[PDB]
Amino acid sequence: RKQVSDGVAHIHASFNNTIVTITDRQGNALGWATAGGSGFRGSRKSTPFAAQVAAERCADAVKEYGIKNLEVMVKGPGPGRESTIRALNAAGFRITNITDVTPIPHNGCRPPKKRRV
Amino acid sequence: IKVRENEPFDVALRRFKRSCEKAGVLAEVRRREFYEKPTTERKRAKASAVK
Amino acid sequence: RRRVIGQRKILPDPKFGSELLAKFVNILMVDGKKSTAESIVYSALETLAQRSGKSELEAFEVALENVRPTVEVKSRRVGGSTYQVPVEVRPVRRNALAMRWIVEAARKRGDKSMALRLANELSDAAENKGTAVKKREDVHRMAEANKAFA
RNA sequence: GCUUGAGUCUCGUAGAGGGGGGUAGAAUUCCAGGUGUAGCGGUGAAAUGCGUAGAGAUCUGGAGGAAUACCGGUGGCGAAGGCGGCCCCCUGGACGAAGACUGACGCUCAGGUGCGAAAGCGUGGGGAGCAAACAGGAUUAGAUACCCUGGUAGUCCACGCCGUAAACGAUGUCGACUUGGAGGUUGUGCCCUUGAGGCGUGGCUUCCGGAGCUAACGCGUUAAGUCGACCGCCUGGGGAGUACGGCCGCAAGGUUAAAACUCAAAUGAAUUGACGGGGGCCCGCACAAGCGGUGGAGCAUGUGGUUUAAUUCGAUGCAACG
């Protein structure tokens, strides 16, 4: 019941899952979505056409205000960097600026050895 | 990476910044590092680029 | 394997003369006793009169409408495991496939006799009933219902 | 005596060469607070784990440590090991050019001295991420592993020690000769320098390759070709870089280095093929698409069993069993 009018939307695009939260201008949570919470779980998610149905769920929780326009914050790789923005363009929302906020360091921390099969 | 356009449309322009960073220098990190594995495979893949 | 020719031109119904109904009787046929097939379906096909009262002709196609799918699965030996990538279904098999469900499920109906056990199914087809109509959604719940892979 | 070897002087050039001290930006983690709400994280799946004591996400502020995307290259510097952000201070070597100077002052070098990746060791600091050990979860016949959730030493700093590596070009240093082609990087001379530019002449360096060399692979002016000077080293495989003794070390352990006995080979490259849970391209009812079966049932038939005085001999993966 605040009517933020316009607020950026963060798209935490990951591999094992993807989640988009339609925060406000300053950066306050107004409504978040989630593939894991979008019916199918396990790992069936991930896929782009699976995240789209997730972020689209926001237009059902963050619609209580009246977002007439909004930007997009895509972070991290994975099947949900495009899908999300698309579903949002159809949901009825607008757009003000697309950008990738993926954490790309300068050889700072030393990543995990991991995987070796 | 900074998009912005007048006349609402979901054209793209987005894959334009997708040529300098993006999912590349990302997966580059992802798993472990490299150390000797790169200086080597980086100097062998170079051989490939000849013909 | 690599062979690429054409389809087998089937002989039309023993009366209405229609390939669509032709392969229909064949799919229904059994033990090469094609005769019985005709005398078993050609009857129930017209017995619709008692079930309606008019030029029972399009009823067949209309009944198949409620049994015409447009999406199926297809496991693929990729990604180490086995995909499922669902895909639609061309017309060539749409009409065909349906006919199977209409018959291959009209036999387990357990009514008076195959001759009639089949007739009723047609009425249940357009009116949605029996496994015949079931198989549709029970199949659609995969394709278009799991596009995550499609 | 001489000057071409070697060296000095001058003036330039490029460089992640070294030692010290600063400093910047991205990211991670953590602490605090705001928004907001039932998931997050992870895998092939899962589970451990974290979440309603409010996570994850998101945003604001703060603390701290490690490493410096892009440039980055088939690149550069160094004796080797190795050396990447920007800035300053102290410092080494390499190269070019007009030249000027010294005058064989050189090459190599057992012993000797010094430098040495990483791991490790001692004292004291530091500690974000990562991660031997260790602990859970999973996989599996088992799984003291690979995978997942955590995580200590350690990785970082100082100072001292240890001296090893597939410390590799598996190719000692120095010098002179010997067809060529394309390229990289850096200096210099010259050319309507009118240009990106064009022609030479030095340094270092890639790839192809001729003669020749080679057991073959291949090396080929940066030689494994043709020669000269000095040094290190090898003499069948196993036993064994082990034992013993010496020396070194805080300790790991290092260095030097056998015998007994045992085998008739151990080995190198290349060839033919077989195979690969290697790659490319193919065909077969091989699969996929369907039609009907076998597997259950009663009976037939054969076989292995079991039995029998005998249950006659044979046939036994697809190729054995109507």
Swiss-Prot record, chain A:
Gene Ontology CC annotations of this record: cytoplasm; cytosol; cytosolic small ribosomal subunit
InterPro entries referenced in this protein's UniProt entry, alphabetically: Ribosomal_uS11, Ribosomal_uS11_bac-type, Ribosomal_uS11_CS, Ribosomal_uS11_sf
Gene3D superfamilies: Ribosomal protein S11 (3.30.420.80)
Alphabetized UniProt keyword annotations: Methylation, Ribonucleoprotein, Ribosomal protein, RNA-binding, rRNA-binding
More details: Has been predicted to contact the N-terminal domain of IF-3 based on footprint studies; exactly how IF-3 interacts with the 30S subunit is controversial.
Membership in a protein family: Belongs to the universal ribosomal protein uS11 family.
Protein name: Small ribosomal subunit protein uS11
Originating species: Escherichia coli (strain K12)
Gene: rpsK
UniProtKB/Swiss-Prot annotation, chain B:
Protein role: Probbly involved in recognition of ribosome rescue factor SmrB in stalled/collided disomes; fusion of protein fragments to its N-terminus decreases ribosome rescue in the presence of SmrB.
Domain of life: Bacteria
Keyword field contains tRNA processing: no
Name of the protein in question: Small ribosomal subunit protein bS21
Record GO biological process: cytoplasmic translation; ribosomal small subunit assembly
Coiled-coil portions: none
Gene source species: Escherichia coli (strain K12)
Keywords recorded for this protein, A-Z: Ribonucleoprotein, Ribosomal protein, RNA-binding, rRNA-binding
Assembly: Part of the 30S ribosomal subunit. In stalled ribosomes contacts ribosome rescue factor SmrB.
Gene it is expressed from: rpsU
GO function term, MF aspect, one: structural constituent of ribosome
Record family assignment: Belongs to the bacterial ribosomal protein bS21 family.
Recorded GO CC terms: cytoplasm; cytosol; cytosolic small ribosomal subunit
Biased composition regions of type Basic residues, renumbered to the chain: 43-51
From Swiss-Prot, chain C:
Keyword hit for rRNA-binding: yes
Disulphide-bonded residues: none
Source superkingdom: Bacteria
Record-level Gene Ontology MF annotations: mRNA binding; rRNA binding; structural constituent of ribosome; tRNA binding
Mutation effect (M114G): Significantly decreases affinity for its own mRNA
GO biological process: cytoplasmic translation; negative regulation of translation; ribosomal small subunit assembly; translation
Keyword annotations from UniProtKB, A to Z: Ribonucleoprotein, Ribosomal protein, RNA-binding, rRNA-binding, tRNA-binding
Quaternary organization: Part of the 30S ribosomal subunit. Contacts proteins S9 and S11. Cross-links to IF3 and the P and E site tRNAs.
Protein family per UniProt: Belongs to the universal ribosomal protein uS7 family.
Anything else known: The strain K12 sequence is shown.
Name of the featured protein: Small ribosomal subunit protein uS7
Residues of the full protein shown: 3 to 152 of 179
